[PDB]
Design goal:
The structure holds two protein chains of two kinds.
Chain A: E1 5-9, H1 15-29, E2 35-36, E3 39-40, E4 54-60, E5 66-72, E6 77-83, E7 86-89, H2 95-100, E8 106-109, H3 116-123, H4 134-145, H5 150-160, H6 162-166, H7 168-179, H8 188-194, H9 197-207, E9 213-221, E10 227-232, H10 233-240
Parallel strand pairs in A: 1-4, 7-8
Antiparallel strand pairs in A: 2-3, 4-5, 5-6, 6-7, 9-10
Helix pairs in contact in A: 1-7, 3-5, 4-5
Chain B: E1 9-14, E2 20-23, E3 34-37, E4 47-49, E5 55-57, E6 60-64, E7 73-76, E8 89-91, E9 95-97, E10 104-106, E11 117-119, E12 130-132, E13 138-144, E14 148-153, E15 158-163, E16 173-175, E17 181-183, E18 186-193, E19 200-206, E20 216-217, E21 223-225, E22 230-234, E23 244-247, E24 257-260
Antiparallel strand pairs in B: 1-4, 1-12, 2-3, 4-5, 5-6, 6-7, 8-9, 10-11, 13-14, 13-16, 13-24, 14-15, 16-17, 17-18, 18-19, 19-23, 20-21, 21-22, 22-23
The chains are: A alpha+beta, B mainly beta.
The structure holds a molecule of 5 linked components (NAG-NAG-BMA-MAN-BMA) and beta-D-galactopyranose.
Organism (chain B): Sambucus ebulus (Dwarf elderberry)
Domain Ricin B lectin (chain B): 7-132, 136-260
Binding site for beta-D-galactose 2 (chain B): 22, 25, 35, 113
């Protein structure tokens, strides 16, 4: 099947271009959606016709290498990637994926799943110690293009794309990383919002459109690693800058 | 499927100048007025929000003495109170309103002891409230347009856009719970608009809970002036120290703002 695409070329890429990229990305997946408090809720699984379930992302490294990843429109998750004729899927890969993605490419099943913990263990390192930014991204593509260190490399892609699309806070960090070509490791807060996306999605939906307070509180980490709990939307937003919501409730 | 009904939760009410809403002298007796007071632990400062759209402290419902502009707020028995003077709504814009009358909770002044009342919704900053257990203001960096930051300069009466420097004290803002934005190390100064018309400049005035100082951080990335529905815009024309003004929403980048919390 032919799925829409969103590409980002590192070669001569500015912070603005990146911003535009994360923009087209959100539009593509936030299609056919009712939103809460201004934030769209990814279509339920039982609503997205296969023809519009996956969106293809095209990332090219400085030397021209292009790696394509298919993201599930229902959860904004990265489900598989292909490069130079070959394609790869995680162990949990559902027939739907293989059956409709990268047809015409030698497909491969991986020895692991796409969990932040699974990826972490398979990689042999924890997100906290991995560098993100222009170079890490470029060097991440090459690695995947040559089917090597796929795990640790996926962690760079994931945080620099799906996560960015999710949290505008991350979008910023990354944006700044390009603007002055440096590198950074995720801080306690960043990873904190990454692991609680679902909870946030829950809290926000429960209260319903406009209602400010949360019935429960979200646990987030401060820079010092000190526990922090947001109990109201504005707080959650102002801190994370969340952009997309994951369907959990129905209100 | 279908949002589960939440259980009654307890939180405090932070409003104007950071003061908390608490029942006078902690008297649980029917009729006791509602007022402002520094945020502490005192049980009477705690409010439980039930699904019946009613908020109550020490068991008594928060009731609107009257349903017209000027009527004061106080506590009383829910079973005998009026089924409308006990119903409240908490909106993200920071608006606590009474469905029936349409009047919103108000704080005439920021002086503790001030009795809260029901008033006509004019979106002033005196009608800006935030209910949460975290009673502190979020200190942050206000990044925008060209990766530059909102910087208060000189005699804290002007705000220009300059290259972001986290350590620059003049680039640190405190997102108060009363919906006003103030200078971190000068929380008496609020980011203020010179008017409610397009192109109206944006400077730094004394905090008085005016409609010109009430801001709402919309999830779309924009910051709006509830009263004028106008948003913060960065004058592109400027080479350096580009100024900010209020301009009708357009969607353009210079109307995008990201609150990067430096501390939380
Ligand atoms: C945003 O704006 C707010 C408002 O000003 C700032 O918050 C204040 O920050 C300052 C700066 O850190 C805080 O002062 C610190 O106070 C420490 C404690 O001093 C008191 O000691 C007496 C003892 O007699 C007690 O009675 C008091 O209760 C206090 O505890 C003071 O020690 C500290 O210095 C530090 O120096 C070194 C560390 O480098 C240590 O050796 C030392 O022990 C101490 O840690 C500071 O002077 C002040 O408390 C804050 N006030 C409020 C209301 O928050 C934010 O800092 C601003 N945001 C940013 C990002 O800057
Ligand atoms: O202004 C009257 C004050 O009376 C005290 O007894 C009470 O603890 C304060 O919170 C405040 O209500």
């Amino acid at each position: 099947i032919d799925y829409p695409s969103v590409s980002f070329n590192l070669a001569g890429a500015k912070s603005t271009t990146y911003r535009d990229f994360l923009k087209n990305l959100r539009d593509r997946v936030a299609t056919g959606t009712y939103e809460v408090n201004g934030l769209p809720v990814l279509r339920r699984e039982s609503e997205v016709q296969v023809k519009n379930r996956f969106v293809l992302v095209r990332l090219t490294n400085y030397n021209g290498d292009t790696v394509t990843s298919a993201v599930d429109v229902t959860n904004l998750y990265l489900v598989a990637f292909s490069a130079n004729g070959n394609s790869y899927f995680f162990k949990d890969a559902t027939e739907l994926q293989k059956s409709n993605l990268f047809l015409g490419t030698t497909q491969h099943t991986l020895s692991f799943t796409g969990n932040y913990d699974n990826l972490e263990t398979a990689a042999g390192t924890r997100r906290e110690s991995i560098e993100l930014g222009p170079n890490p991204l470029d060097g991440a593509i090459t690695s995947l293009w040559y089917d090597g260190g796929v795990a640790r490399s996926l962690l760079v892609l994931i945080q620099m794309v799906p996560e960015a699309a999710r949290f505008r806070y991350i979008e910023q960090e990354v944006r700044r990383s390009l603007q002055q070509l440096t590198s950074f490791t995720p801080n306690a807060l960043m990873l904190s919002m990454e692991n609680n996306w679902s909870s946030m999605s829950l809290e926000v939906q429960l209260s319903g459109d406009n209602v400010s307070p949360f019935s429960g509180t979200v646990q987030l980490q401060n820079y010092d690693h000190t526990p922090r709990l947001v109990d109201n939307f504005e707080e959650l937003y102002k801190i994370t800058g969340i952009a997309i919501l994951l369907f959990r409730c129905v209100a | 499927e279908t949002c589960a009904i939440p259980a009654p939760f307890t939180r405090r009410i932070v409003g104007r100048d950071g003061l908390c809403v608490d029942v006078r002298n902690g008297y649980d007796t029917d009729g006791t007025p509602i007022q402002l007071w520094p945020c502490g632990t005192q049980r009477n400062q705690q409010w439980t929000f039930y699904n019946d759209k009613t908020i109550r402290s020490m068991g008594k419902c928060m009731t609107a003495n009257g349903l017209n502009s000027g009527s004061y707020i106080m506590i009383t028995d829910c079973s005998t109170a009026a089924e409308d003077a006990t119903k409240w709504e908490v909106l993200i814009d920071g608006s606590i309103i009474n469905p029936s009358s349409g009047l919103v909770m108000t704080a005439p002044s920021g002086a503790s002891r001030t009795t809260l009342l029901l008033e006509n919704n004019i979106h002033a900053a005196s009608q800006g409230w935030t209910v949460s257990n975290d009673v502190q203001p979020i200190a942050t960096l206000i990044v925008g347009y060209n990766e530059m930051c909102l910087q208060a300069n000189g005699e804290n009466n002007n705000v220009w856009m300059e290259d972001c420097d986290v350590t620059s004290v003049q680039q640190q803002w405190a997102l108060f719970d009363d919906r006003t934005i103030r200078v971190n190390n000068s929380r008496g100064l609020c980011v203020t608009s010179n008017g409610y018309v397009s192109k109206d400049l944006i400077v730094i005035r004394k905090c008085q809970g005016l409609a010109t100082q009430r801001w709402f951080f919309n999830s779309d990335g924009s910051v709006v002036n509830l009263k004028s529905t106008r948003v913060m815009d960065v004058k592109e024309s400027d080479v350096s120290l580009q100024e900010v003004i209020i301009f009708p929403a357009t969607g353009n980048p210079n109307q995008q703002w990201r609150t990067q919390v430096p501390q939380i």
